[PDB]
């Protein structure tokens, strides 16, 4: 599948992201073996995005939509739902499944 969502800690079970809302998260991105390539936690600066604008990889678009506020989850994202056969220069190999540890902090 494009994205698999595995819950580390549950959310509120009620408030799921909608278009027009700003999602505020912490994340760590890694390959399937846990090798880290990026993190907002390390910047002590949360990351913000919105649905419906093609502004995040599709695995986030579909994965974070399945999370409720407060949830921490592992999103396992297939290459086609991430950087595909290309990868990301300097960072992500071709054909890489990505794992993001995401905490959905709030909706703004
Ligand atoms: C203009 C520079 C502008 C950069 C900004 C705002 C700095 C960010 C804080 C960090 C960078 O985005 C950094 O994050 C990563 O380390 C990372 O962990 C990651 O994969 N993401 C970050 C968290 C959310 C999921 C995912 C994502 O979707 O990021 C978006 C991304 C790169 C979407 C593309 C858009 C084109 C489209 O063709 C492509 O489809 C395949 C998807 C990003 C927030 C953009 O919306 C904004 C930017 O690129 C990748 C490995 C390398 C990245 O550097 C470039
Ligand atoms: Cl935003
Ligand atoms: Cl925006
Ligand atoms: Na943008």
From Swiss-Prot:
Domain PPIase FKBP-type: 20-108
Pfam families for this protein: FKBP_C
Gene Ontology biological process: 'de novo' protein folding; amyloid fibril formation; heart morphogenesis; heart trabecula formation; negative regulation of activin receptor signaling pathway; negative regulation of transforming growth factor beta receptor signaling pathway; positive regulation of canonical NF-kappaB signal transduction; protein folding
Keyword Nucleotide-binding: no
Subcellular location(s) per record: Cytoplasm, Cytosol; Sarcoplasmic reticulum membrane
GO CC terms: cytoplasm; cytoplasmic side of membrane; cytosol; membrane; ryanodine receptor complex; sarcoplasmic reticulum; sarcoplasmic reticulum membrane; terminal cisterna
Activity regulation note: Inhibited by both FK506 and rapamycin.
Residues recorded as bearing N6-succinyllysine in the entry: 53
Record-linked PROSITE patterns: FKBP_PPIASE (PS50059)
A molecular function (GO) term: type I transforming growth factor beta receptor binding
Chief place where the protein resides: cytoplasm
PTM-bearing positions, type N6-acetyllysine: 53
Swiss-Prot/TrEMBL keywords: Acetylation, Cytoplasm, Isomerase, Membrane, Rotamase, Sarcoplasmic reticulum
Taxonomic superkingdom: Eukaryota
Signal peptide interval: none
Role summary: Keeps in an inactive conformation TGFBR1, the TGF-beta type I serine/threonine kinase receptor, preventing TGF-beta receptor activation in absence of ligand. Recruits SMAD7 to ACVR1B which prevents the association of SMAD2 and SMAD3 with the activin receptor complex, thereby blocking the activin signal. May modulate the RYR1 calcium channel activity. PPIases accelerate the folding of proteins. It catalyzes the cis-trans isomerization of proline imidic peptide bonds in oligopeptides.
Subunit structure: Interacts with TGFBR1; prevents TGFBR1 phosphorylation by TGFBR2 and stabilizes it in the inactive conformation. Interacts with ACVR1B and SMAD7. Identified in a complex composed of RYR1, PDE4D, PKA, FKBP1A and protein phosphatase 1 (PP1). Interacts directly with RYR2 and RYR3. Interacts with GLMN; rapamycin and FK506 abolish the interaction with GLMN in a dose dependent manner. Interacts directly with RYR1.
Protein name: Peptidyl-prolyl cis-trans isomerase FKBP1A
Organism name: Homo sapiens
């Amino acid at each position: 599948p494009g994205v698999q969502v595995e819950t580390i800690s549950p959310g509120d079970g009620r408030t799921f992201p909608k278009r027009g809302q700003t999602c505020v998260v912490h994340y760590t991105g890694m390959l399937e073996d846990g090798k880290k390539f990026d993190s907002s936690r390390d910047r002590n600066k949360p990351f913000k995005f919105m649905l419906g604008k093609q502004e995040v990889i599709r695995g986030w678009e579909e994965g974070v939509a399945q999370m409720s506020v407060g949830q921490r989850a592992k999103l396992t994202i297939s290459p086609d739902y991430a950087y595909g056969a290309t990868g990301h220069p300097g960072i992500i190999p071709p054909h890489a499944t990505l794992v993001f540890d995401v905490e959905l902090l709030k909706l703004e």
